[PDB]
């Protein structure tokens, strides 16, 4: 919301989100208590909609632009877990870090065979 305001004021903004995975982990923690049948790996049934309804409003527009960098934790280093898998579609440039490189002392540990950009 604070970002959208500066955007609509005509300005251009930088939005850094430190870990967007926690936004869906907090949804998963609460889902079962809200009485909703679990889904693929225990995730809330509304995972993709909860994630889209946020990431669709963090965008640039004709009246201003938001430039955003988002860290995305992948659990158990499984790049196919539903939460990263459903997040991949919402980003223009995706940089994929890996433990097998960081264990070589090669920092930054970007994996050049998985990073891409529109």
């Amino acid at each position: 919301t604070m970002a959208e305001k500066f955007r609509d004021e005509g300005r251009d903004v930088l939005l850094f989100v430190d870990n967007i995975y926690r936004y869906t982990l907090a949804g998963t923690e609460v889902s079962a208590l809200l009485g909703r049948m679990p889904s693929a790996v225990g995730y809330q049934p509304t995972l993709a909609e909860e994630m889209g309804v946020l990431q669709e409003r963090i965008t640039s527009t004709k009246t201003g632009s938001i430039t955003s960098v988002q860290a995305v934790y992948v659990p158990a280093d499984d790049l196919t877990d539903p939460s990263p898998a459903t997040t991949f579609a919402h980003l223009d440039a995706t940089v994929v870090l890996s433990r097998q490189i960081a264990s070589l002392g090669i920092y930054p540990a970007v994996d050049p065979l998985d990073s891409t950009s529109r």
């Binding site: 433990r99 097998q100 490189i101 264990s103 070589l104």
Partner: protein
């Protein structure tokens, strides 16, 4: 060579002359020049190597066990 106490015959394996060794030398000049290479006769190593190449193909083990390398 019959030395004082020991006579030794240094036989050779094949007939030798000049009409022949020159034929062999021309053939070798010819093989190198034509870029002709023959196969070895090791029908065992060939089968071993082929089974080893086929077993190791598309194995992708290192992408799967996270060996850092």
């Amino acid at each position: 060579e019959v030395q004082p106490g020991n006579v030794t015959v240094l036989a050779d394996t094949a007939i030798r002359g000049q009409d022949l060794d020159e034929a062999r030398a021309m053939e070798a000049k010819r093989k190198a020049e034509e870029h002709i290479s023959s196969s070895h006769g090791d029908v065992d190593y060939a089968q071993a190597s082929a089974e080893l190449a086929k077993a190791i193909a598309q194995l992708r083990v290192i992408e799967l066990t996270k060996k850092a390398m």
